[PDB]
Amino acid sequence: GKVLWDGRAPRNYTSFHLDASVDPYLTVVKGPRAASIYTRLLGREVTPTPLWNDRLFPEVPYPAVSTEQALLVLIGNSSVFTPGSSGRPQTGFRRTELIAQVNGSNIDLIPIIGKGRVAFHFSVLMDEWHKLDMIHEHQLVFVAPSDGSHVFTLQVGSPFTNPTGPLPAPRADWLKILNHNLDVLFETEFTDETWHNFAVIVDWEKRTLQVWYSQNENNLVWVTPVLPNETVKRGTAGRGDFHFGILKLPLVNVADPPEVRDDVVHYGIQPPTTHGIMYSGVFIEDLEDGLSVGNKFIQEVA
Ligand SMILES: OC[C@H]1O[C@@H](O[C@H]2[C@H](O)[C@@H](O)[C@@H](O)O[C@@H]2CO)[C@H](O)[C@@H](O)[C@@H]1O
């Protein structure tokens, strides 16, 4: 399809771009430190997903050239988001996110990524140096309407519950795609040293979702049918911004009064530890001709 927004970090992108919050990323959703403190551009240290590589002729010595660099998104004890200038700090969450924008504007992108059929691409790689704690829930990728709901979510870690249940949950370390109602559509183990490639097709007209997945250099394959996602609101209230990064929920603190334990935005246990995940292959396309499945192939989608 036609690329509507490209979040595949250029090889020439720098910390200075992130700190200026310029295209393609709005960088405001983070703690008070500079964007480049939480999000690192990995250069040639980490090979990004091979799906969007270019290929050389001849095919030795180098078969492939990377067309992007991977991003390392970190959260730590300072990763407390304050809404606006004056909001109550979100002390229950630890979060660092990048939001899709064009011309310095998330607003202008809403109608573009929110009409017709749109494929949301993203690949993730486990960070071995700052391990995620799968005792907690992490919301990694989502499209969020103004009400803060998620049209879909890529999640990993044990889902937050009040009261606390057995932890870790079964398959806590499985990546999960959820619908807007939080139903698990697809789940797969978050194996290390592997690029986990996804596309989620949103049909904004019919309010459906379809999940596509592969590992490493393998082309995306469909792993769900076209599924209804009918809890999404009608019209503009069902559209919203594309986020990727880490949004870590807390655990219940029984020391808190019962009346606030559900308010994970402001209450709950968060250890003062650092955690990361790596991203590549993050972009949004329409479905003209078909879905980009990797390796310079398109596949027609019904
Ligand atoms: O309110 C609890 C839910 O918070 C969700 O995070 C939202 C938040 O509510 C919004 O105000 C805004 O800050 O965006 C956040 C991320 O979309 C969270 O996703 C849910 O899991 C919580 O139940």
Residue nearest to atom 8 of ligand 1 (CA): 148
Which H or E element spans position 35?
Answer: helix 35-38
Does 140 contact ligand 1 (Cβ within 6 A)? Answer: no
Q: Which atom of ligand 1 is least distant from the CA of 95?
A: 16
Residue nearest to atom 4 of ligand 1 (CA): 265
Residue nearest to atom 22 of ligand 1 (CA): 264
Q: Which atom of ligand 1 is least distant from the CA of 139?
A: 19
Specify the DSSP class assigned to residue 81.
Answer: P
Q: Which amino acid is at 301?
A: V
Of residues 248, 268, 244, 275, the one with CA closest to residue 138:
248
Does 84 contact ligand 1 (Cβ within 6 A)? Answer: no
Of residues 139, 119, 135, 221, the one with CA closest to residue 180:
139
Does 144 contact ligand 1 (Cβ within 6 A)? Answer: yes
- Give the separation between CA 282 and CA 299, rounded to whole angstroms: 18
Residue nearest to atom 6 of ligand 1 (CA): 148
Q: Which atom of ligand 1 is least distant from the CA of 160?
A: 21
- Give the separation between CA 115 and CA 190, rounded to whole angstroms: 31
Does 80 contact ligand 1 (Cβ within 6 A)? Answer: no
How many other CB atoms sit within 10 Å of the CB of residue 105? 11
- Solved with: X-ray
Of residues 24, 21, 33, the one with CA closest to residue 5:
24
Question: Is 81 exposed, middle or buried (CB count within 10 Å of its CB: 0-12, 13-18, 19+)?
Answer: buried
- Give the separation between CA 67 and CA 64, rounded to whole angstroms: 9
- Indicate the SS3 state at residue 232: coil
Of residues 223, 216, 242, the one with CA closest to residue 294:
216
- Give the separation between CA 64 and CA 62, rounded to whole angstroms: 6
Residue range 3-51+63-299, CATH number:
2.60.120.1160
* Contact by Cβ (8 Å): 34, 19: yes
Q: How many CA atoms lie within 13 A of 31 on its CB side?
A: 22
Residue nearest to atom 15 of ligand 1 (CA): 148
- Give the separation between CA 290 and CA 60, rounded to whole angstroms: 31
Please report the sign of the dihedral spanned by the C-alpha atoms of residue 238, residue 232, residue 139, residue 116: negative
Chain centroid offset of residue 128 CA: 18
Q: Which atom of ligand 1 is least distant from the CA of 142?
A: 17
Residue 199 corresponds to which tokens in the numbers above? Answer: 């596309």
Q: For tokens 């999000």, what's the residue?
A: 39
Residue 238 sits at φ, ψ, to 5 deg, of -100, -10
- Give the separation between CA 225 and CA 198, rounded to whole angstroms: 15
- Indicate the SS3 state at residue 36: helix
Q: Ligand 1 pocket test: pick from 246, 247, 265 the residue with the most ligand atoms within 8 Å of its Cβ.
A: 265
Resolution (A): 1.5
**DSSP H helices in 85-215:** 110-113
